[PDB]
Amino acid sequence: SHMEAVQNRIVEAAERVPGVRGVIHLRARYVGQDIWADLIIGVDPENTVEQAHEICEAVQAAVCGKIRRIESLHVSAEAR
Amino acid sequence: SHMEAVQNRIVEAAERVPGVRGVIHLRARYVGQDIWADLIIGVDPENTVEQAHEICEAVQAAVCGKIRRIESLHVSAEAR
């Protein structure tokens, strides 16, 4: 599938960002030629809530920078 | 509405739990006579991710303990 290549690129890009302890969940869909995606990342339980927010914002920048067709990306965090 | 009384009870119960800095979002719906609800609470940005998780679990217990018709409640947290 065209989509599985894209999903591989999101996961790979997310996992390279400092503080990411793996991708817990990824759901991606096409809206025309654009991708909209929902991503959940793992983070250190001892990080602050503010740190987990910064890591999500860094994941969003890194993913959207690498995958140009992404036009909406939501990133949240869970302790792992 | 029957629902607005219930929504008032969820918000009130959530806000009385230690570490809750207000209810950011509440969406509740009936599935037959049962309530299913999605709640977002505010928390101190300097709490740990583990602390924010404990506060959500305490909100879930407190809300479900006070409002017997709730059969599904999801609680997440945001810095505020």
Residue numbers in the entry:
A (entry chain A), B (entry chain A): 212 to 291
Copy out sentences from the published article reporting this entry, exactly as the authors wrote them.
The cation diffusion facilitator (CDF) protein family, a conserved family of transmembrane transporters found in all domains of life, ensures divalent transition metal cation homeostasis at the cellular level. CDF proteins usually form homodimers and share a conserved structure containing a transmembrane domain (TMD) with six transmembrane α-helices and a cytoplasmic N-terminus. In the model strain Magnetospirillum gryphiswaldense MSR-1 and related MTB, this behavior is based on the formation of magnetosomes, unique sub-cellular organelles that are composed of nanometer-sized crystals of the magnetic mineral magnetite (Fe3O4) surrounded by a lipid bilayer membrane. It was recently proposed that the magnetosome membrane-associated protein MamM is a CDF protein that acts as a magnetosome-directed iron transporter, as its deletion or single point mutations within its CTD abolished magnetite biomineralization.
However, a large number of the MSAs showed that L349 in ZnT-10 is homologous to M250 in MamM. M250 of MamM is found at a similar position in the center of the β-sheet as L349 in ZnT-10 and both residues have similar properties. To ensure that the MamM CTD can serve as a reliable model that will allow us to gain better knowledge of the disease-causing mutation in ZnT-10, we performed in vitro studies of MamM CTD M250L, as a representative of wild-type (WT) ZnT-10. Crystallization trials of 6xHis-tagged MamM CTD M250L produced a crystal that diffracted to 1.79 Å resolution. The crystal structure shows high similarity to MamM CTD WT protein (PDB code: 3W5X5) with an RMSD score of 0.21 Å (316 atoms involved, for further details see Supplementary Fig. S2), indicating that the leucine maintains the structure of the WT MamM CTD. The free energy difference following the M250L substitution was found to be 1.6 Kcal mol−1. MamM CTD WT and M250L spectra are very similar and show high content of α-helices, in agreement with their crystal structures. Accordingly, all the in vitro experiments with MamM CTD M250P showed that the proline substitution causes severe structural changes while the M250L mutant preserved the WT CTD structure.
